[PDB]
Amino acid sequence: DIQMTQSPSSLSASVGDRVTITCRASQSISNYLNWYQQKPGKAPKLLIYVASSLQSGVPSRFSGSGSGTDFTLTISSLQPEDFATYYCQQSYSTPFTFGPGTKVDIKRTVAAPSVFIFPPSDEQLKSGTASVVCLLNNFYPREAKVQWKVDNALQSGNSQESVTEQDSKDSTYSLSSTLTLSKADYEKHKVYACEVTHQGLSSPVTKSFNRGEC
Amino acid sequence: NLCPFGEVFNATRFASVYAWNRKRISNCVADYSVLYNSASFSTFKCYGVSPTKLNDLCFTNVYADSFVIRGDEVRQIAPGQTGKIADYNYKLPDDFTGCVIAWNSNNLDSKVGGNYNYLYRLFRKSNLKPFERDISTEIYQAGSTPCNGVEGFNCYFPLQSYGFQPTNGVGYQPYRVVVLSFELLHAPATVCGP
Amino acid sequence: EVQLVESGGGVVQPGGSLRLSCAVSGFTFDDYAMHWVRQAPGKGLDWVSLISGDGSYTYYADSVKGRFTISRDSSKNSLYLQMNSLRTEDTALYYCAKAQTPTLWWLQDAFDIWGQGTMVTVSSASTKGPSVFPLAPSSKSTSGGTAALGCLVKDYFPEPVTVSWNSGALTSGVHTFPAVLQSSGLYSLSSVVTVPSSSLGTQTYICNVNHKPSNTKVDKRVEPKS
Ligand SMILES: *[C@@H]1O[C@H](CO)[C@@H](O)[C@H](O)[C@H]1NC(C)=O
């Protein structure tokens, strides 16, 4: 299969910005490269075909270039309706393959996450599982690192993260990290902490509790 | 708008036949008889149309397929032919509507010691469907032993170089081929004669 | 206006079968190659299969070859994908897409119009309602700022669940996160809200959780503790 890559994986931009994103094919595909644009909950729309031709109804601020292996999509002045994920796709050879996408989101002033930690409820502990939830609320940019520490020991493999779409009102994100332990392992330790690093935080922030409101 | 045929026939570089180039022609006017009366073409065979009646017909799409093969193989570029090229590289349908144009290109496409550049597919597990193109380079597993990505015992790299040497006889000399096909569908017929 | 409308998706067990349909209007169907492209939850685009205008040529992604069969019916202006021996990793929204160029060929083209997709979910999990647990606000915050509370909606199948707060009367500052698929095959999701801490003693806060496939409808009160 011809492998398609894209760069950057994500881009923060403001209205009026010039935006350049790129797509690479693992071998020559001549100019048989298409660009699609996709917004959450919606099907992709054809934007550019055969590397440089604009689909009907696409405005002139868009252009595409490249032939062979390296292609670029350029938006000369980003408009609100352009925030989306962009995918390139080679049509030169079956099976057809797609790049992994570049998401262009709305730049806004940095906002540090407000962090909250939630111990497992007594109800759930009756059931034999402990879920510990760490919330990162209303932050920008999207990048954030959340690490769990149990009695100061770094956890791996026992947490999952979920993130919201960029908020329509304040352009922030929120994120949950859930630590899942058996009741047996949960009661083997005292201190449960999630530690967060983010551009808006000069130093990593920790929220913690001692098992049993201690 | 004159159809961009001069970029097809006079392109500096031509595709290997296994990766035959296909150019879609549309929204333009074309003078086909000028091609027929060229005296540089040693082959000019049409099917389902007359070379004369081409200028009085319109089509939805014209396709221009081009590649290099050896002189002995031009005969395989026709409907109902068999051989390595027809079976494994470039296959024309029975109801082919178009023309096959070829000319000796020994001056351009032969190189002393051999040309590495032009390739053809020698092994395939099945024959090509008409107008199918196959650019894969997976090793051909002729037997039961796995090849693990490398040529070897019963394990053949599927493409071979022609090795066009300038001193070869005409049958082993390189020929550039351009195949025109004409497609009429319900969509508007935008490419017309003069 | 060109229109493509997919149907036939649903929850299947691994190894099962399902047939997808795509009804098309607004163009000469037979002039165009047609395609199926799928999108795994939270993933990118993945091309599955094509069929030329007259049905004579078809192609498949390696991952589905030998299991899937694509076909079209000119009389019904319809495209089908017959999906046999389904695997969990076949779980995706399945789009049908029309090739841009009227031609009997199928390469070097673009997909100018896409349907909105039909969801295919391949799992061995059984229908199961969620347990709902409070995410209780901290009693330690002395700051007059906003406080966070929420509800954990753990271990349900299939998607989706819906969560409201105070019967739809509380919507500002609500974040209901997308579900995660846990290794047990069950989904989990939290819904949180930030409120003024100055209201924590007065205002009651109840999350309303509904999971139609299991007929679960739970209201969980969320209040400070001790
Ligand atoms: C290619 O170039 C030659 C000479 O420059 C010219 O006579 C011929 O017509 C050209 N072929 C086409 C198809 O334009």
Side-chain angles (χ1 to χ4, degrees):
Chain A
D1 290 4
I2 311 182
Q3 298 297 314
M4 313 296 312
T5 52
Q6 291 178 239
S7 167
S9 50
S10 78
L11 180 60
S12 295
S14 285
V15 167
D17 275 13
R18 183 176 180 93
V19 161
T20 302
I21 72 187
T22 71
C23 166
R24 187 188 304 271
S26 61
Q27 71 178 266
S28 175
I29 61 169
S30 176
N31 59 351
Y32 295 119
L33 185 119
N34 308 309
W35 291 91
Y36 304 91
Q37 168 200 77
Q38 179 172 56
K39 308 187 179 168
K42 297 274 317 182
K45 293 181 168 161
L46 173 62
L47 207 76
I48 297 204
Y49 57 99
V50 189
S52 54
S53 300
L54 261 64
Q55 171 69 331
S56 210
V58 173
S60 62
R61 59 173 180 282
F62 285 88
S63 72
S65 60
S67 192
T69 61
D70 293 322
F71 307 81
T72 86
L73 178 60
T74 305
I75 312 169
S76 58
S77 165
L78 198 70
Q79 295 307 123
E81 66 265 34
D82 301 336
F83 295 98
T85 301
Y86 294 80
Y87 295 96
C88 66
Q89 173 243 329
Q90 62 85 13
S91 62
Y92 180 64
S93 160
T94 36
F96 300 131
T97 47
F98 289 88
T102 293
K103 181 175 179 183
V104 183
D105 86 350
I106 307 165
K107 198 182 290 274
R108 57 147 290 163
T109 64
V110 176
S114 314
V115 184
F116 309 85
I117 192 167
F118 294 99
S121 72
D122 290 326
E123 211 208 308
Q124 185 195 19
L125 285 171
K126 309 279 156 275
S127 77
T129 296
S131 297
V132 195
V133 174
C134 176
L135 167 60
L136 282 59
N137 202 51
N138 293 3
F139 60 89
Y140 187 91
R142 156 73 181 91
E143 291 63 36
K145 179 146 116 178
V146 187
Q147 289 200 317
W148 286 97
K149 289 173 152 230
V150 179
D151 285 338
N152 213 41
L154 174 65
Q155 303 303 285
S156 78
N158 52 10
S159 67
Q160 297 182 279
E161 277 182 21
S162 180
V163 75
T164 58
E165 287 307 311
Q166 190 163 31
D167 187 90
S168 61
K169 296 152 155 77
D170 62 27
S171 290
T172 71
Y173 297 93
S174 292
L175 181 146
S176 67
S177 183
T178 306
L179 175 71
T180 303
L181 303 169
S182 64
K183 191 178 85 119
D185 292 337
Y186 176 68
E187 296 164 335
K188 282 172 179 23
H189 298 112
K190 192 176 59 103
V191 183
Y192 287 86
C194 85
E195 168 183 67
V196 176
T197 86
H198 181 270
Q199 187 184 347
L201 296 174
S202 35
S203 34
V205 160
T206 301
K207 297 291 171 168
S208 50
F209 67 86
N210 301 316
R211 178 183 45 85
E213 190 61 80
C214 158
Chain B
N1 299 184
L2 300 212
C3 295
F5 281 136
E7 319 176 14
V8 176
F9 292 87
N10 279 344
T12 283
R13 258 313 293 282
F14 261 53
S16 271
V17 65
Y18 84 96
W20 47 276
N21 202 267
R22 165 154 276 189
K23 166 82 158 89
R24 181 160 70 81
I25 303 283
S26 83
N27 286 94
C28 60
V29 317
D31 189 17
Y32 299 104
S33 280
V34 152
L35 304 163
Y36 196 11
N37 323 117
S38 189
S40 39
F41 300 136
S42 40
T43 302
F44 206 119
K45 309 195 170 134
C46 301
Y47 305 86
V49 289
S50 277
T52 65
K53 80 153 55 59
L54 278 184
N55 306 63
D56 312 309
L57 256 163
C58 292
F59 293 105
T60 303
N61 306 301
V62 175
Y63 283 118
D65 305 338
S66 47
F67 48 75
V68 168
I69 51 170
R70 66 186 172 88
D72 273 339
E73 291 174 338
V74 173
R75 55 157 220 85
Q76 296 189 37
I77 316 292
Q81 298 290 333
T82 55
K84 294 294 136 150
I85 309 304
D87 298 342
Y88 293 163
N89 285 262
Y90 182 81
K91 169 63 166 188
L92 291 179
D94 284 13
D95 60 356
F96 175 59
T97 305
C99 305
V100 170
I101 309 160
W103 67 94
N104 188 289
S105 61
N106 197 49
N107 56 313
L108 295 175
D109 292 321
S110 54
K111 259 84 202 182
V112 47
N115 199 344
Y116 309 89
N117 187 249
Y118 288 112
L119 308 179
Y120 66 94
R121 188 175 300 281
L122 178 56
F123 303 104
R124 213 182 177 258
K125 280 297 172 44
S126 78
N127 287 3
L128 288 179
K129 308 308 196 298
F131 297 132
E132 196 182 5
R133 191 169 56 209
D134 183 359
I135 61 142
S136 72
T137 56
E138 71 153 352
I139 308 296
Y140 181 84
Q141 189 187 316
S144 55
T145 301
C147 304
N148 298 306
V150 152
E151 101 178 345
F153 163 76
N154 292 343
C155 284
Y156 311 129
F157 194 75
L159 316 180
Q160 199 99 324
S161 177
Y162 274 108
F164 289 124
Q165 320 197 256
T167 53
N168 290 143
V170 290
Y172 289 77
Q173 282 187 23
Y175 275 63
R176 290 183 173 191
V177 175
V178 169
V179 177
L180 301 182
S181 56
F182 307 96
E183 198 169 26
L184 182 62
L185 305 175
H186 310 88
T190 64
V191 48
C192 288
Chain C
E1 144 187 89
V2 173
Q3 279 231 276
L4 311 174
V5 177
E6 304 96 336
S7 45
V11 178
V12 201
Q13 303 246 40
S17 289
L18 201 65
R19 184 169 94 130
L20 306 187
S21 317
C22 162
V24 316
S25 51
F27 64 99
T28 320
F29 185 50
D30 291 357
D31 276 9
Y32 297 92
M34 299 288 305
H35 304 258
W36 289 96
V37 182
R38 70 192 179 171
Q39 186 155 36
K43 291 297 173 284
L45 300 168
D46 172 28
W47 174 90
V48 179
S49 178
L50 67 84
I51 181 162
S52 68
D54 62 21
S56 58
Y57 189 82
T58 64
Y59 210 90
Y60 301 87
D62 293 318
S63 58
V64 307
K65 193 190 213 182
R67 300 186 299 117
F68 288 16
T69 302
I70 191 181
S71 59
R72 54 196 302 158
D73 188 322
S74 184
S75 71
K76 300 156 128 62
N77 285 307
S78 295
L79 176 74
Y80 310 95
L81 188 65
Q82 173 64 51
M83 298 184 296
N84 299 323
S85 298
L86 282 154
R87 319 175 193 163
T88 58
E89 69 266 25
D90 292 320
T91 293
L93 194 69
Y94 282 69
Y95 304 104
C96 70
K98 154 197 178 295
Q100 173 171 48
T101 311
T103 182
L104 291 143
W105 211 40
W106 57 88
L107 298 184
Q108 304 181 177
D109 208 3
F111 312 133
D112 64 341
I113 173 62
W114 305 51
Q116 284 318 302
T118 183
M119 190 62 196
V120 171
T121 311
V122 182
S123 176
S124 61
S126 299
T127 306
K128 178 191 176 309
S131 320
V132 183
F133 304 112
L135 297 173
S138 175
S139 38
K140 314 204 276 258
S141 160
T142 178
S143 147
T146 75
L149 55 100
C151 272
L152 176 61
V153 185
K154 196 169 161 286
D155 295 332
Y156 66 92
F157 180 92
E159 286 265 66
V161 300
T162 64
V163 181
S164 68
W165 285 87
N166 293 352
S167 304
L170 175 52
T171 63
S172 149
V174 169
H175 295 307
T176 303
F177 295 95
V180 297
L181 177 55
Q182 304 172 109
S183 78
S184 62
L186 305 183
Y187 295 92
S188 177
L189 168 161
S190 276
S191 179
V192 312
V193 58
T194 49
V195 303
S197 67
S198 88
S199 73
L200 269 191
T202 325
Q203 186 56 254
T204 279
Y205 293 108
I206 297 176
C207 68
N208 321 104
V209 179
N210 211 324
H211 181 243
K212 296 212 166 101
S214 78
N215 195 36
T216 305
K217 169 144 183 175
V218 177
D219 309 303
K220 215 54 156 214
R221 165 76 160 285
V222 188
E223 52 195 34
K225 171 190 185 168
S226 300

